[PDB]
């Protein structure tokens, strides 16, 4: 099916403490494959998945200089944006950047992304047309004019439609045995009376890849979203994910309730019962 590549940069200023911390991570789908840490010893782009380790020294040199580059850009940008917003010198602030691409089952380019944040909220973002920008406020409008004059959007689009997609496609082949596999959820159900009258039904899904999954409860065939405690999908720390959905029922009626599991690795959606 469809696949994605994503890079996430995070630069946090620490006034007095020294130089801004810079963290970079790369993902193919729900799989992290690279990493860079300003405070770490190596000062290199590091592998974080096995299939990226077949890339030679030139790759690692290029990625390390590109990611150190970006770190220094955020450095001066941190200063600039502090000035835009008239903020004190003794405050810590956060620039966050995200870009990447989507490809179809045929590996053909679907979408490009480029978005920046200041202090956890939108700053500036590339549009669907890969040509215009969207500024969140007035400070971002100043950045938007600089980027217009420097023709940054053309650079963005050139990357998103080229280097990004073809390296996405490379990774999917080279890491085929890991990236293109679908692990179906291992389901099971639990039960916890809360009183002699009422009891909890919890529907589990474990060991699934990728992260996208859907759990729904149905009393008598009608959907339930009025008791369903859904937890945020979580990593097991072995490349798979977990999720559960709980429902509270009047004791004696639990055979009316069915959990429905929709996942990509499932030929057809599962149904469970207590």
């Amino acid at each position: 099916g469809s696949h994605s590549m994503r890079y996430f940069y995070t630069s946090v200023s620490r006034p007095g403490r020294g130089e801004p911390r810079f963290i970079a991570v790369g993902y193919v789908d729900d799989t992290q494959f690279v990493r860079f840490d300003s405070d770490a010893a190596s000062q290199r782009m590091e592998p974080r998945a096995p299939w990226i380790e077949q890339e030679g020294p030139e790759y690692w040199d290029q990625e390390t200089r590109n990611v150190k580059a970006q770190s220094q850009t955020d450095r001066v940008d941190l200063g600039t944006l502090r000035g835009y917003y008239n903020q004190s010198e003794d405050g810590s602030h956060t620039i966050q950047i995200m870009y990447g691409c989507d490809v179809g089952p045929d590996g053909r380019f679907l979408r490009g992304y480029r978005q920046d944040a200041y202090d956890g909220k939108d700053y500036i973002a590339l549009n669907e047309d890969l040509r215009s920008w969207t500024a969140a406020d007035m400070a971002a409008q100043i950045t938007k004019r600089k980027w217009e004059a420097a023709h940054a959007a053309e650079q963005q689009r050139a990357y998103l439609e080229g280097r990004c997609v073809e390296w996405l496609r490379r990774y999917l082949e080279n890491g085929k045995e890991t990236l293109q596999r679908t692990d179906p959820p291992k389901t099971h159900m639990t039960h916890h009376p809360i009183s002699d009258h009422e009891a909890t039904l919890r529907c589990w899904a474990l060991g699934f890849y990728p992260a996208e999954i859907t759990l729904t409860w149905q009393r008598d065939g009608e959907d339930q979203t009025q008791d369903t405690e859904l937890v945020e999908t979580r990593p097991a720390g072995d490349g798979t994910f977990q999720k559960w959905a709980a429902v509270v029922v009047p004791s004696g009626e639990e055979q009316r309730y069915t959990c429905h599991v929709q996942h990509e690795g499932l030929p057809k959606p599962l149904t469970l019962r207590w």
């Binding site: 890079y7 590109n66 580059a69 850009t73 600089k146 940054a152």
Partner: peptide
């Protein structure tokens, strides 16, 4: 990653 040969992209 972007071959940021630029910073035709400072904010």
């Amino acid at each position: 990653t972007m071959v940021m040969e630029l910073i035709r992209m400072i904010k």
